[PDB]
């Protein structure tokens, strides 16, 4: 009751989301040794596992997320964790055409993604998403909104009778972020027609981000059974939450 998120203004919403931004982590990548399928997957597994820890504590700082029960928080992160990892990677890689910036010291192209079976198809989709963000000139204030929308939306339709107020509370915060996105576009001098069009363009990208997450989840499940590189205990938990 008396939710802090519903009281926040548009500029306050942006500030809270920008303050909650997780850091950009480094990997154990050594440029001396060339790439192997086990080594590159080990680097990406080690990196994604450490990013998951920061994401979980970033989610606590998303307005309205703390108001949900622990069971709902677990469910939202379990279904949206890979989507959030991917949109963050795509955001980091905007200023590097044809390259994915997994870490400031780990910059890969679509050729090096071929070192893992099936990974090349996921690399191309992440690159096309990064080109789309660059094509639209995505702003950091818009990015932090989309990332929070993914957390609240991706698992809200996968939720008995009394908990409908919890689903309704999430939709109230989702509309709050929509007002924030429109408020951002109005400040940048966009007409009402331009605000609606850009709003639609941004939300349609989340459809493709879901598609990449579903394909990425199947690829991670493949590496688990392939047993070539071990996965962390947290990634195995998040991965088994989709089967």
């Amino acid at each position: 009751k008396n939710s802090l998120a519903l009281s926040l203004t548009a500029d306050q919403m942006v500030s809270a989301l920008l303050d909650a931004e997780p850091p950009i982590l480094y990997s154990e990548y050594d440029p001396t040794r060339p790439f192997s399928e086990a080594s590159m997957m080990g680097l990406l597994t080690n990196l994604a596992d450490r990013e998951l820890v920061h994401m979980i504590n970033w989610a606590k700082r998303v307005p309205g997320f703390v108001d949900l029960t622990l069971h709902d928080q677990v469910h939202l992160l379990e279904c949206a964790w890979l989507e959030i990892l991917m949109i963050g990677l795509v955001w980091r890689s905007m200023e590097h055409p044809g390259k994915l910036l997994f870490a400031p010291n780990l910059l890969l192209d679509r050729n090096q993604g071929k070192c893992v079976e099936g990974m090349v198809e996921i690399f191309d989709m992440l690159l096309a998403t990064s080109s789309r963000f660059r094509m639209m000139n995505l702003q950091g204030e818009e990015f932090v909104c989309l990332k929070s929308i993914i957390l609240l939306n991706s698992g809200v339709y996968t939720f008995t009778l009394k908990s409908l107020e919890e689903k309704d509370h999430i939709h109230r915060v989702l509309d709050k972020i929509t007002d924030t996105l429109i408020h951002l576009m109005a400040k940048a001098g966009l007409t009402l027609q331009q605000q609606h069009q850009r709003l639609a363009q941004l939300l349609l990208i989340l459809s493709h981000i879901r598609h990449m997450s579903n394909k990425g989840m199947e690829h991670l499940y493949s590496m688990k059974c392939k047993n070539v590189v071990p996965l962390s205990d947290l990634l195995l938990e998040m991965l088994d939450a989709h089967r």
Partner: peptide
């Protein structure tokens, strides 16, 4: 005993 639980749990 989920890891995601405890990481969300502790304060």
């Amino acid at each position: 005993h989920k890891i995601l639980h405890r990481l969300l749990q502790d304060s």
